Amino acid sequence: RELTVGINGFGRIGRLVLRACMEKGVKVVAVNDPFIDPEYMVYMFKYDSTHGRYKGSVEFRNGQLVVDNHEISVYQCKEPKQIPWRAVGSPYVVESTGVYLSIQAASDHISAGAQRVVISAPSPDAPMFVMGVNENDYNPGSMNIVSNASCTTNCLAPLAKVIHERFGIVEGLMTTVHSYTATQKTVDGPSRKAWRDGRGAHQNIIPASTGAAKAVTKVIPELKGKLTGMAFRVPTPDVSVVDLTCRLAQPAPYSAIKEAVKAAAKGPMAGILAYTEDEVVSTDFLGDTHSSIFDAKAGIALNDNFVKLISWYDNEYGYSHRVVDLLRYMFSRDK
Amino acid sequence: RELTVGINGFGRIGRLVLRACMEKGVKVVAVNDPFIDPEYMVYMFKYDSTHGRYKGSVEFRNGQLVVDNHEISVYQCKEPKQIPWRAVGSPYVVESTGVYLSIQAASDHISAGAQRVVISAPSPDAPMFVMGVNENDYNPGSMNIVSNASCTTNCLAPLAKVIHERFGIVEGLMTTVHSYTATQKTVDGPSRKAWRDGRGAHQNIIPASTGAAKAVTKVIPELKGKLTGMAFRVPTPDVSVVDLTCRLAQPAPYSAIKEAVKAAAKGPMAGILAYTEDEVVSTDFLGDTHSSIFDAKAGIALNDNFVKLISWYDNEYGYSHRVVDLLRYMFSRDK
Amino acid sequence: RELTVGINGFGRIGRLVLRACMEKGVKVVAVNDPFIDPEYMVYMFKYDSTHGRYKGSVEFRNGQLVVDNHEISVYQCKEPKQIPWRAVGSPYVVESTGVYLSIQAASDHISAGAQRVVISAPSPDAPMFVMGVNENDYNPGSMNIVSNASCTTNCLAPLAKVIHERFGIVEGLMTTVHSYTATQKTVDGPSRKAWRDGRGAHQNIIPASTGAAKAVTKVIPELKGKLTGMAFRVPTPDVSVVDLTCRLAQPAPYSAIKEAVKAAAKGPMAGILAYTEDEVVSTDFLGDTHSSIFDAKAGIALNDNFVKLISWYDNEYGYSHRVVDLLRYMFSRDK
Amino acid sequence: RELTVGINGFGRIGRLVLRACMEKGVKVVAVNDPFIDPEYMVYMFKYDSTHGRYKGSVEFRNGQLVVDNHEISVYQCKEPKQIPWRAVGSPYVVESTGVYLSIQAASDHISAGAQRVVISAPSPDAPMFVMGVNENDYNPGSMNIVSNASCTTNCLAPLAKVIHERFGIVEGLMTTVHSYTATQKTVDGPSRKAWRDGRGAHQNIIPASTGAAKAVTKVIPELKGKLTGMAFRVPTPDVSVVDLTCRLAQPAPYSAIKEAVKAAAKGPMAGILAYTEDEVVSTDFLGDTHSSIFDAKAGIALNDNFVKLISWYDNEYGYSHRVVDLLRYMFSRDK
């Protein structure tokens, strides 16, 4: 009858997905996190260093989290197979722990009673979607587990779609200047799988690998072989920026680029891709719900066919809203 | 014949204790850390965001860490009982993992072949020592496991000793404005045992409990019931400052306070307590080996009997040097 | 018939005083700042790194700043004597440049047409006020020029008043752990009058002198000779915290301290002094309009007569709201 | 007979140029700065938040700054014409105030007695030099006033030269992720000429214009029309990184790119361009004297003819050392 949502992992994304659900009237029926009990959940949800105090009521009772008088069941189980999703009636599940990324890992949610899973990160094998770019590729009859890609992919892909469709991208290389995240360390500590990521997050500019640019070629297949990139993690707690250097097939004077993006933002990519000519900086996008905000004045062209395009994204807040948008879209298709 | 040292936990303290050992000619025969293999140890030891590149050679071979041509065995075991300390001849062990704080937990090192253990943190029951204040209380014949207290206790106790012995402390309350540490989080995350400590370390001033002031009354028994305090964690990666507000029994004009501290620094507390009248800030003490650096100009008196005294400490580097000093002292007593 | 406000200095306080005026329905008729033209004022007012985008419309036309359709004259003169306050009909002027602090300096506003002046900083000779503590000492007949004291004094004085009147303060020493401000430097630079203040604000814990605690004894004369203190500037961009260590005459068990502050917050100091028992950190007070938020759990007592009390303040936002409250109060009295 | 140096502007570059002079045995005979007297110069030179305490003696007497027993005259004049350079016998002058960038402005140093001037910043008309790239274009007879370009240009040009001469650069776009500097603000403040630069430096990723990439085409004329770029200022106090995305004429497999850079670093560009394959982050280059350190592992190729190349630089320290190198080179040529 209605979209209902379960959240596994009540972290930055989990908690802000709940905020976005409340904002968009999406019913959340349960949250699972073995490291956060109901009373502690109230505290973590209510106070946020980055996005301020929750505007509304947050309480706990009867083993439940209660937000704006909406009662939410709280589970404390460590593995998807163990979560009693059936107890709250076959919800759509957001998998936002960061550690159950494969179809096999996520499918345990379905076994445990979930109707669908949205993995809030790229997956090695789950079908990947970026709202505004390829959500139409979703087939309810054949797909119960999907990925909403990464924050960076959701920033680049809408922009790349507009630029490629208007001018043709011959080749492009991306850099994201990216806020630090929960995977990083306060001071130099162990990060066996990726040594640089262990170094103090607040002290350093840290180069990092990312598949985000290549992932864009998954949701825009015409761009296979034509995009890749990397990241720098820097000492800001939220908001990131994509820096796309691309060679274009058709001449693209910068004024034409601006008109193409502005047209997309006003029309078919409204709410996903935005456009600004203001003298903005990263904090100006705290709480912004867009996937991608094109920065007209920040970019620079060498010539009509070789340009550097700049687009902002609140990697926490924009992405969380896209998770909710994908859920709502999936539900609209699954009737 | 000679002091030999094993380090359990190759973290901020573990690695800087190794630096201090190399600087002071103390032989380190082994390091244990299940999360850092020899090649990775080379990297973590060589590069440091806070204290710069190691000045010397760092290599690995034959399963060993080699620093300035000194070969160091590397073990990868998760529990003290499992570490083959016997294989490197009954070393003195630095327990710097942060999770084996009790006499019972640390005693497994002895069972595994260690001759002594120095816990690099306060212990609920191990005898506690602050160099320059009460190391004489150490008895080799009855004590195989000891604690070197905390960075903050090592800052406050030498100062409190000088002030109490000259003027008499009637009562005192301490605040430490303290750099963030590895126990904290880059962004708002779970900290069940202490909620505030979960909040983003780089964004916040964070109140925290600390037993450091009360611990001073353990090493200066005359001050039992007369000292306690608390902490603020702030967005700096290293160096902290003690803020001691105390009522004194004898009149203590600030000039007399300065002369007492200066006399102690030049004489019996040389190398432990230092004295400055310069316009210093926290970064000026990066790499400082003193336990406590009295800041003459920063303090303020209401009157001759009620004063606020300020003292700096490199919570990483000073403390690591005191660990080494305690080891050397213990060895000198144990012959 | 109505209060009208002119703002000299469109900085952090000037701009946030304008926000507070909009929030409280106070008519602002002019802003003077020689370094910010109308178009640039729009930008600086609309976007804020700390307090977010202005929720409303901001535009310029006809040499005026227009906020939520309210037309505001913009002047560009470098000295108070030169500002054409008469052109907007004898406004109450907020002096928030930071460089006209004396009665003599500020009085040039009056000669230029201002009805009254509120200096948004302590003054060497202008009478100082803290709302909720001594505004009733305002005398319209004789006080054309007043001072709203400092952010820190507005935090400490309400708390000091409650504690003194309930328990009697014998003596106290204050530390404020304080966010950096516009007077500080991004990297080590010149600060002739105060050397430590030149050192990089984002890298350092910086001791600083402040007259804030002594200033409390001016607005609460019964505390003359009983308070002083100092500051540490730390790497946060806004929100600060008072750390008051005091000796009390009457027995002051911490439970009794909490009931006294709670009662004050609910009654005579409502909207000025708040009370919390939550596990708060500095960012939880971004945008808070209170002068002082008592942190029950952060404080610690040595005994019934010697305690450390902790209270938060948004040094930008709370203080700006108090400027507006003082303006409104003065106006109601000048009738 | 010998090189003697005068420094105008005792800021980050002025002070670290003095450090580099001491390190390289270059005689500094005078420093001019109207905002820093001899006693204050001692303090600012001795203590450094970024690069640590000066390892040596620093004192003042007889109106002079004395470093390692070298007596340095201290002048306090506000304009180049007014500085008594003649009193110290026709020194080579480093113009590091940031406000005398043209040949016309800087030439007043010559009228005041200077032998030559090195502007420590790009100039609109003074010839620009990058050591290791085009110092041989220096012509003593006709060039009294020169520019050492920018920190960023000194990073990019050596790399661009190596890559162009080996593979041929068809076109390239540069981003520098750059530490904040003294021109920026601690909190949102006025920056009329460049609005984004006024926004809080420690809170924001800040896009900025830079002519650095185009400047490379001035010192490497064969690249005219083939390079431009932009900057992001981020919350680190020192060390920056160049991100060069270029299209290459000859096939440039990444292995061949590494051999070309490595060979340059070992030979013709030794001490200017370095090469590393370690997992480095920005703080690992604090105090590094190279203009450019190529980060082999950080870069990524889309294909053999389209690559992203990453190179580090200590924008303060490396550049200061290059100023000294240019002075010495000019002197050897003026003989």
Ligand SMILES: NC(=O)c1ccc[n+]([C@@H]2O[C@H](COP(=O)([O-])OP(=O)(O)OC[C@H]3O[C@@H](n4cnc5c(N)ncnc54)[C@H](O)[C@@H]3O)[C@@H](O)[C@H]2O)c1
């Ligand atoms: N923070 C961002 O900018 C961002 C943006 C897009 C996607 N993501 C992705 O979202 C996912 C979560 O990222 P995050 O930033 O919220 O990290 P996070 O650390 O803040 O949140 C992870 C949460 O999952 C909990 N958790 C850990 N193991 C669990 C388990 N077995 N079962 C249930 N809960 C568990 C943790 O207690 C924590 O609260 C990751 O895959 C991340 O890559 C993050």
Ligand SMILES: NC(=O)c1ccc[n+]([C@@H]2O[C@H](COP(=O)([O-])OP(=O)(O)OC[C@H]3O[C@@H](n4cnc5c(N)ncnc54)[C@H](O)[C@@H]3O)[C@@H](O)[C@H]2O)c1
């Ligand atoms: N950082 C400071 O300022 C400071 C000062 C004084 C004392 N201490 C104390 O020193 C101890 C370590 O602190 P830290 O800052 O170095 O933390 P840290 O996280 O940087 O180091 C801990 C190290 O121990 C390793 N480790 C974890 N579990 C282990 C296990 N079972 N066996 C072996 N190694 C293990 C970790 O891999 C890590 O390298 C703590 O008790 C701390 O309270 C810290």
Ligand SMILES: NC(=O)c1ccc[n+]([C@@H]2O[C@H](COP(=O)([O-])OP(=O)(O)OC[C@H]3O[C@@H](n4cnc5c(N)ncnc54)[C@H](O)[C@@H]3O)[C@@H](O)[C@H]2O)c1
């Ligand atoms: N920021 C705080 O936390 C805080 C709190 C309370 C009080 N104050 C005090 O308020 C006053 C301003 O502080 P601030 O933080 O807003 O500093 P600020 O630098 O942000 O604001 C100063 C403003 O005044 C402008 N200005 C400079 N000279 C001027 C002149 N002759 N005429 C007109 N305008 C001029 C500047 O362009 C700037 O916009 C200071 O006295 C400060 O001590 C600051």
Ligand SMILES: NC(=O)c1ccc[n+]([C@@H]2O[C@H](COP(=O)([O-])OP(=O)(O)OC[C@H]3O[C@@H](n4cnc5c(N)ncnc54)[C@H](O)[C@@H]3O)[C@@H](O)[C@H]2O)c1
């Ligand atoms: N800091 C860097 O990373 C870097 C690198 C390369 C080049 N530069 C350039 O070097 C120059 C200085 O940069 P900075 O970072 O040292 O800035 P800075 O603010 O730290 O130094 C400027 C110094 O010049 C002084 N000064 C100001 N006006 C003066 C005057 N008329 N006469 C004499 N002294 C005066 C100031 O007191 C200050 O000490 C600038 O042109 C800058 O673009 C900076």
